[PDB]
Amino acid sequence: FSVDEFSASVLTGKLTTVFLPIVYTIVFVVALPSNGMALWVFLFRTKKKAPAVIYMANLALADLLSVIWFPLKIAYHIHGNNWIYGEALCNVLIGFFYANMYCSILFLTCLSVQRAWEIVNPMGHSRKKANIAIGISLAIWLLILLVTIPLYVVKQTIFIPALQITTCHDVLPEQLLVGDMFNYFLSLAIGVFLFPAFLTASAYVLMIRALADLEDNWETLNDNLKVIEKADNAAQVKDALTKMRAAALDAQKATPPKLEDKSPDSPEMKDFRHGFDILVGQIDDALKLANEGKVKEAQAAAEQLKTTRNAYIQKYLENSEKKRKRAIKLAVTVAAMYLICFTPSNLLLVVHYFLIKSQGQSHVYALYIVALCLSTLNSCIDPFVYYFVSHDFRDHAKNAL
């Protein structure tokens, strides 16, 4: 019938009627074609069909299924927060809003863990692992469809006589359900926010370090090689070759960056390991001379090791440092998405309903609105995610501009 003064000022203020439709318009122009093309690439241009592509396809799908409703969302705010399209259509927008909110987090957790898991403990069932990833996506989609039930089924529109407007979502029509609303958004903020954030952050912890460990093995290989050429005694040559061998065997076990989604049984992957077999064999040739007593002769074999390193190794292990940089930028991209889109929203969602439950009004109402607005930016940050993960997306991204 009549809301609190603080809410009524916000619902008539420029923050909702000017700032919001502008930001939302930007998101519409930016996010719709970007995710539109990304979804197209993952379906009709990606011939790898790896579990990472599948997660990113649903991520783009979650983005699209929300941004398409933005023209009605923009029009709503421009006309002073007044909904004239019906209660059912309001609950649609509300549904797909919270759906993309939570699908994004869950699909980010899947993608981040999956990509980190292919580095720590890689497997070789690209076809089976894909089918699994599809099933997981269906499971996620249905679990969210079920969890967003108390948002679809409840009256989300109210006519405010003093404001002469019909608000959608922004005003709770039944102030008696605040108790239920509080617990609900507190459950999600823990189980669908913090818990996936914990799994997301630690995934990059293991991913980055391992990509710095591949850098360590390449570094140790180049460091010990320089020691042999400068060494004088037999003990300095014998130990440096044993250390260079251990680093070479560990680097062979790891997956190269040029051939990412290429299975460990593929002929391209065999070429990378072939260069290592010539390299390891040459360390064995040097050790044989070192064990017999020939120091200056061990030393001459290291010069042959530089020839194999510049022809086969500095072609595949050539761009492993570029792969490390992509993972970092990805970790930055994700962190910004959490810092801007996820954390301000979930935190305030609890805060907002907590105050309405305790006092009947919340002074964080303006922050709650700004938070919900900035949360939609995730679909604008999502294309940067596809750029650092998908190799096929980069081609279509670069060719377009």
Epitope: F1, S2, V3, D4, E5, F6, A8, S9, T12, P161, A162, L163, Q175, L176, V178, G179, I356, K357, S358, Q359, G360, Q361
Partner: antibody, heavy 119, light 109 residues
Framework: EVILVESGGGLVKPGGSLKLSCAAS????????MSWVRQTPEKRLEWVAT????????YYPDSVKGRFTISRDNAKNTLYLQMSSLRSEDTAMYYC????????????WGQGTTLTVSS | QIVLTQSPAIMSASLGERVTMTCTAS???????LHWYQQKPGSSPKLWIY???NLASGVPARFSGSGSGTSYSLTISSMEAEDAATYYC?????????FGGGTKLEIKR
């Protein structure tokens, strides 16, 4: 900090018209909603009218509606409450109150004005 | 139109007692809509406990309101002489915004 004073009342002939002035100080009048609450001789409180801070947005209960007209003045910082066709049931202490929020209700009250509707 | 009944309408309590006074409603009201008011004879009824639990500015710690849904109550840990006043419960859930009966608190001698 915030203080309110009511002016008017007195002996009124039944079936007439009267104005009640509520003075405000210490806050921004337009930034807060205002309301009038009456108290019968049996010390029983009853809601009369509440006006929104944005503009002329009036609402009265069925028993009050059609007679009372709550007037607002932001530039003069004084709240009004005009009556028409007065009854002997209107004999009550009329209090002025500042409604901050719906969940906060009337945080600041006035002092009261004696109204004795009798011929 | 929710009817607010205050039980008891009049009660005597000696200083230092755990004073409790209830406010019953006809239909279900949110815990965010029931507010308490203290009224001393001659003076205006000033805000005491807003939205069943939260206390207003200058209100002593001895007051701690509890209750939600249909059952609502004002609780005083230590009874004092200045507490002797009429207490009213107010709702803003549905128009008309009805007030309570009034629990007249008096000193037991």
């Amino acid at each position: 900090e915030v203080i309110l004073v009511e002016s008017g009342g007195g002996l009124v002939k039944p079936g007439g018209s009267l104005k009640l002035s509520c003075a405000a100080s210490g806050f921004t009048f337009s930034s807060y909603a205002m309301s009038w609450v009456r108290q019968t001789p049996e010390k029983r409180l009853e809601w009369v009218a509440t006006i929104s801070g944005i503009g002329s947005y009036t609402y009265y209960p069925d028993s009050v509606k059609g007679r009372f007209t709550i007037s607002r003045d932001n530039a003069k910082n004084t709240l009004y409450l005009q009556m028409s066709s007065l009854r002997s049931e209107d004999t009550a202490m009329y209090y002025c109150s500042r409604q901050d929020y719906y969940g906060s209700s009337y945080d600041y009250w006035g002092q009261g004005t004696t109204l004795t509707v009798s011929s | 139109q929710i009817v607010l009944t205050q039980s008891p309408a009049i009660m005597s309590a000696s200083l230092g007692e755990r004073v409790t006074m209830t406010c019953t409603a006809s239909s279900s009201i949110s815990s965010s809509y029931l507010h308490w008011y203290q009224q001393k004879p001659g003076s205006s009824p000033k805000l005491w406990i807003y939205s069943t639990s939260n206390l207003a500015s200058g209100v002593p710690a001895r007051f701690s309101g509890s209750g939600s849904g249909t059952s609502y109550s004002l609780t005083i840990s230590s009874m004092e002489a200045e507490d002797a006043a009429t207490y009213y419960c107010h709702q803003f859930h549905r128009s008309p915004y009805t007030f309570g009966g009034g629990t007249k608190l008096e000193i037991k001698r």
